[PDB]
Amino acid sequence: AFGILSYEHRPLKRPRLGPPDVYPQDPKQKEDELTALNVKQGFNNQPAVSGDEHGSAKNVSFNPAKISSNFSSIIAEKLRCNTLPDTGRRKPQVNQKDNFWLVTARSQSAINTWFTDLAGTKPLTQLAKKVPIFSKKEEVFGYLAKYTVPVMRAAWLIKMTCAYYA
Amino acid sequence: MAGNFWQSSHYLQWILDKQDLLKERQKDLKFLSEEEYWKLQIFFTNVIQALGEHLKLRQQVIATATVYFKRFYARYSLKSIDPVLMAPTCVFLASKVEEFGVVSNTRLIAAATSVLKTRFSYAFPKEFPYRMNHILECEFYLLELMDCCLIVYHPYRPLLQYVQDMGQEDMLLPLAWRIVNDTYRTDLCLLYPPFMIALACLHVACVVQQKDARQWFAELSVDMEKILEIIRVILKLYEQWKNFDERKEMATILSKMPKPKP
Amino acid sequence: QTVDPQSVQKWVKFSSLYVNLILSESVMNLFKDCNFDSCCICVCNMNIKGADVGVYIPQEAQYRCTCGFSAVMNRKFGNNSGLFLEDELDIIGRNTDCGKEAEKRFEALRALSDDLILLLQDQCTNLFS
Amino acid sequence: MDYDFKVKLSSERERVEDLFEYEGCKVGRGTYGHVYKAKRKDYALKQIEGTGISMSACREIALLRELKHPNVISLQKVFLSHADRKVWLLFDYAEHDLWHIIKFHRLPRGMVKSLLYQILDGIHYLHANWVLHRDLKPANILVMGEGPERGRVKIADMGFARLFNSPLKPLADLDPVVVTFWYRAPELLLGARHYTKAIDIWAIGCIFAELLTSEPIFHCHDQLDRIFNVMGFPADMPEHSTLMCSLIKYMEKHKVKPDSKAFHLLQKLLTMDPIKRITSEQAMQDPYFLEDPLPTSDVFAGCQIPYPKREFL
Amino acid sequence: YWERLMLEPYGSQRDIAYVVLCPENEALLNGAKSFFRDLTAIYESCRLGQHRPVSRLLTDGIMRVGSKLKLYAQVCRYDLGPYLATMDRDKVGIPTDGDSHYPPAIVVYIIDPFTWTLGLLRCFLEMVQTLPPHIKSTVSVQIIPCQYLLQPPQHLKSLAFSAFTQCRRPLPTSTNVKTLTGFGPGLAMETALRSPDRPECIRLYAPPFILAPVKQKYNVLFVGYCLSHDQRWILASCTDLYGELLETCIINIDVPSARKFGLQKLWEWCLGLVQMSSLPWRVVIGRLGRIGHGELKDWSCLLSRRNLQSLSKRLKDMCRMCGISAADSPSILSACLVAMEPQGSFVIMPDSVSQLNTPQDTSCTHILVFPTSASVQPNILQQPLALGYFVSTAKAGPLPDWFWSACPQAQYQCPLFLKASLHLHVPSVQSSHPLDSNQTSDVLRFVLEQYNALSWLTCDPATQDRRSCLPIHFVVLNQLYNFIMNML
Amino acid sequence: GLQVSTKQKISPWDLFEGLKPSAPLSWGWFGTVRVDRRVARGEEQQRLLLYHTHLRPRPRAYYLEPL
Ligand SMILES: [Zn+2]
Ligand SMILES: [Zn+2]
Question: Cβ of A150 and E34 within 8 Å?
Answer without folding.
Answer: yes
